[PDB]
């Protein structure tokens, strides 16, 4: 129940890791997002020049 130096460190570790490993979550779901953002706007692009190119 008491609390030692040795739990205390491994505790404090942990806590960095788990935050660390959270940081590296959050950038791969924002990048996940970004990417299929990035694709429908390539898509729309593409199909906007195939519009205008046969309004010319
Ligand atoms: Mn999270």
Same mark, same amino acid.
């Given at each position: ?6 739990? /205390?460190?491994?505790?404090?570790? #942990?806590?960095?890791? +788990?935050?660390? @490993?959270?940081?590296? !979550?959050?950038? %791969?779901?924002? /990048?996940?997002?970004?990417?299929? #953002?990035?694709?429908? +706007?390539?898509? @729309?692009?593409?199909? !906007?020049?195939? %519009? ?5």
């Amino acid at each position: 129940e008491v609390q030692t130096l040795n739990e /205390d460190i491994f505790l404090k570790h #942990l806590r960095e890791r +788990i935050l660390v @490993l959270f940081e590296g !979550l959050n950038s %791969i779901k924002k /990048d996940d997002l970004e990417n299929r #953002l990035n694709l429908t +706007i390539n898509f @729309l692009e593409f199909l !906007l020049a195939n %519009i205008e190119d046969k309004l010319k």
